[PDB]
Design a protein around this ligand. Structure first.
Ligand SMILES: [Cl-]
Ligand SMILES: [Cu+2]
Ligand SMILES: [Cu+2]
Ligand SMILES: [Cu+2]
Ligand SMILES: [Cu+2]
Ligand SMILES: [Cu+2]
Ligand SMILES: [Cu+2]
Ligand SMILES: [Cu+2]
Ligand SMILES: [Cu+2]
Ligand SMILES: [Cu+2]
Ligand SMILES: [Cu+2]
Ligand SMILES: [Cu+2]
Ligand SMILES: [Cu+2]
Ligand code: NA
Ligand code: NA
Lengths: 62, 62
């Protein structure tokens, strides 16, 4: 599986994930005047005001 | 602007872009013995071995 890993609304970049990994993710939260966005391999558990989208196809976490 | 967002050869689906966006895109790349296609809002620049289409009208990125 390969996933995007760029931040914010940056031009897209991709990374390969560890063998068994089935998900890519996009986390979003707010800070002062805007959103923050984090993208990578996996689907880490979130809490306390973070939202996350997880998907299961290559480069899906746009 | 609205753009298609479906993958692959799926039936077309659409999303609404941010207010200032002017482009839609379709991106294709090779994945072993297959191809993957992504669609959405924006126009990432061409780079090695990706095929990129961009256009400027609603749902133009078939
Ligand atoms: Cl992509
Ligand atoms: Cu793949
Ligand atoms: Cu890419
Ligand atoms: Cu922060
Ligand atoms: Cu992508
Ligand atoms: Cu429109
Ligand atoms: Cu509209
Ligand atoms: Cu507009
Ligand atoms: Cu595909
Ligand atoms: Cu090149
Ligand atoms: Cu072509
Ligand atoms: Cu129309
Ligand atoms: Cu269409
Ligand atoms: Na449509
Ligand atoms: Na179409």
């Amino acid at each position: 599986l390969e996933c995007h890993n760029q931040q914010s609304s940056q031009t897209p970049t991709t990374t390969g994930c560890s063998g068994g990994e089935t998900n890519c993710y996009k986390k979003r939260w707010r800070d002062h005047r805007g959103y923050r966005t984090e993208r990578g391999c996996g689907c880490p558990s979130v809490k306390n005001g973070i939202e996350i989208n997880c998907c299961t196809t290559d480069r899906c976490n746009n």
